Amino acid sequence: MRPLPAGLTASQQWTLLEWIHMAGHIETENELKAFLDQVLSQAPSERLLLALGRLNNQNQIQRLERVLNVSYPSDWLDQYMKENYAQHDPILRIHLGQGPVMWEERFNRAKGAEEKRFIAEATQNGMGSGITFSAASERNNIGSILSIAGREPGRNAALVAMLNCLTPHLHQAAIRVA
Amino acid sequence: MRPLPAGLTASQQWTLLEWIHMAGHIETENELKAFLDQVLSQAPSERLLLALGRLNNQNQIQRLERVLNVSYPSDWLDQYMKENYAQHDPILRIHLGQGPVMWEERFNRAKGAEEKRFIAEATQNGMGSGITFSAASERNNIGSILSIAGREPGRNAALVAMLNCLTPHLHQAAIRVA
Numbered sequence A, B: 001m002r003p004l005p006a007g008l009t010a011s012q013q014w015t016l017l018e019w020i021h022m023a024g025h026i027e028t029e030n031e032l033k034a035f036l037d038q039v040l041s042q043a044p045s046e047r048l049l050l051a052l053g054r055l056n057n058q059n060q061i062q063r064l065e066r067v068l069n070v071s072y073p074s075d076w077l078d079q080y081m082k083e084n085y086a087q088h089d090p091i092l093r094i095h096l097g098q099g100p101v102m103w104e105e106r107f108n109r110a111k112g113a114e115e116k117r118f119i120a121e122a123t124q125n126g127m128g129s130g131i132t133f134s135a136a137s138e139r140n141n142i143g144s145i146l147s148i149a150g151r152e153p154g155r156n157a158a159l160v161a162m163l164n165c166l167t168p169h170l171h172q173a174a175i176r177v178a
Ligand SMILES: CCCCCCCCCC(=O)N[C@H]1CCOC1=O
Pocket: A049, A051, A064, A067, A077, A080, A081, A086, A089, A091, A092, A103, A122, A127, A128, A132, A147
């Protein structure tokens, strides 16, 4: 169980409490999207996506089970699907449950030709910077990712810690919804 | 979704945050008992039980699915089973999800002969006073009760509100465990 954030203001503590409390009441996809809309309204980004996947033995997604697009550009997602980006996107190779991953950091470390191609295209589409939080359940090798695009979220240590702590609860909600 | 408590101190707010955060990570019966042990250590009682049941159309338990005895006296539970108290105990007739129920209040309103008999026996066994919190999911007509014996918990408005808010999360955990 990931530790709760230190250094939050009373308002930030209350927000996180509200978020986890609300997450525990989510039963439907509509409720989940609506809740993610509200979370996003508190973050310096307009682009959020949650995905649920079946995992390999190293907690990496081997199959996407459910994608809940809250606010990624539909044209970007259409391209991602058409161009087979799932196979090249470094973010889909994360070991879920191992801590938040900053995209710029991960992208800078990419060496493969197809990976670099993807990164260049993501960059042109305003997706060169962002953060992905994750949680995994080995009850049935299933995990979730919460992705937020932009440079500003990663710079807000409090928000990062709050979203990180929310993620396991979003994961349980996503399992219930699925 | 039940509203979060007003008037909590920062320490009480933190406790509730820790409880709901922890509840969302519970996967096994062992984890659930251990967690309930920790919650009980924060309440003026030594007697706690959680039960999961299938519900009728009015959100009353029609069948007990799982009982997790944390600290009810084993002899009391043995008697409860042997003497068919499930059929007479006013607390098992609660409409789950309709707010905390104070036992003394409920017991004072009992008119049936067998009900009164049960109440007299419960009273002799130190179970004349207490509180039952509840939550229900109509996804599959399933609900949980959290019972705590004693007069002192009910007198602590903050604790009552905190436990009440924790209960839906205990319910989701109990479903996962079952
Ligand atoms: C089935 C295809 C739709 C699933 C797309 C899921 C993408 C999740 C990982 C993620 O956030 N990657 C970022 C990295 C840069 O650009 C993206 O998009």
